[PDB]
Structure 1
């Protein structure tokens, strides 16, 4: 197949399926993790680009890893190069970092409903902006 709108949308939908499931069902484990606080610290040291690569992959992989489900973890690893291709299609470092900062604060503060909403929003926003700029190369 081609690297087209459908490819992009399928990738983001798959991420929503897996990441939201894990955040919803493992919320407390995620909220209490030392990894989350280290990522938060990385973001709070504002270099948007340098903050981004690292923090973004760590945060989204943390949601998945918190399940402890090696099959889920392995499926996410299998699709990671495709996830990463899609990430690199469009640079959105400042705004993604802000969305992450706010997502993390919703998690830590115990706002589970709001955290799930912010993760969905993040992924849909990335999707829309990637599609919006697919012909602006």
Structure 2
């Protein structure tokens, strides 16, 4: 099939399914992880947010999945990662996605589980909307 609106929407919906489940169910492990603080540091360390982005982005989303310790979930996420990576490269949103990550991280470390789950959904839906908005602006 084509690289089209449906392909994009399916990718982001799958991410919401997986990443939000893991954030919700492994919230305390994520919040307590050294990896989270390292990612936060990498974001905080710069004003922009092109260099910051690709690393920090993959690391943050993959952390939520890894924290499950469920090797089947981890493997399924790795299986679809090239597709996830394609879709993220369709539209450059470094500054704004970075801001959303930073806010997500602060909700997590401050213990606002309900708000972190909301922010992760909002973030993925925002990314989706902007990617679809720009599908014909190449």
TM-score category by the smaller chain? over 0.9
CA RMSD after TM alignment: 0.4
1:60 aligns with: 61
Distance across 2 between alignment mates of 1:2 and 1:96: 26
Q: Please give the alpha-carbon distance, in whole angstroms, between the structure 2 residues aligned to 1:34 and 1:50.
A: 21
Q: Which ranges of structure 1 fall in alignment gaps of 5 or more residues?
A: none
Report SS of the residue matched to 1:41.
Answer: helix
Q: Encode CA deviations 1:17-69: one digit per residue, 9 max, x unaligned.
A: 00000000000000000000000000001141000000000000000000000
Higher-helix-fraction structure: 1
TM-score norm. by structure 2 comes to 0.99
TM-score, normalising length: structure 1: 0.99
- TM-superposed CA distance for 1:73, in Å, is 0.0
Q: Deviations over 1:69-108 (max 9, x none)?
A: 0000000000000000000000000000000000000000
Map Cα deviations across residues 96-125 of structure 1 (whole Å, 9 max, x no partner): 000000000000000000000000000000
Structure 1 stretches of at least 4 aligned residues deviating more than 4 Å after TM superposition: none
- Between Structure 1 and Structure 2, how many residues are aligned? 137
